Amino acid sequence: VYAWNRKRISNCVADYSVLYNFAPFFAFKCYGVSPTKLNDLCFTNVYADS
Amino acid sequence: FVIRGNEVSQIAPGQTGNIADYNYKLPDDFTGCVIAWNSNKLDSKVGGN
Amino acid sequence: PTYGVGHQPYRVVVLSFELLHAPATVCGPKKSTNLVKNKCVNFNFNGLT
């Protein structure tokens, strides 16, 4: 946690319905958006912190 | 019915998704209760159910 | 059985109630009293208080 990995994701088409297959988690909690509306709207870049 | 753990949140009014769009759609004016409990000891078998 | 808890099966039961104006058929175990007229009283008619 003190050395969390940051990955920049850009220049690709993002389908957010495969993360459920990727990981066994209950809730795909989001703050500024809704989990089910993530395929219509689109951003500049997205950062993944692990 | 029986669903996955990821699709429990789709059984709710105003929710969209694979299950809520092709299998079971709830009305937006819904007035009722939803009960969900784990059945790993009943609906799961070794090698796949 | 070896998958994570997010992919485990879940049994779901949805109980949908009907707030119609037809006579009620499913009513709870609350007992009914007698009818008093021409007097200021509280009344509970089929859940209408």
User: Which residue from C minimizes the CA distance to B47?
Assistant: C1
Are the C-beta atoms of B6 and C7 separated by less than 8 Å? yes
- What DSSP assignment string belongs to chain C? --S-GGGS-EEEEEEE----SSPP----S--------SS-----BTTB-
Asked if the C-beta of C8 comes within 8 angstroms of chain B's C-beta atoms, the answer is yes
Alpha-carbon torsion, ordered C20, C23, C29, C30, to 10 deg: 90
How far apart are the C-alpha atoms of B30 and C16, rounded to whole Å? 8
What resolution in Å is listed for this PDB structure? 3.3
User: Which residue from C minimizes the CA distance to A25?
Assistant: C6
Show the CA angle centred on residue B2, arms to residues A34 and B27, nearest 5°.
Answer: 50
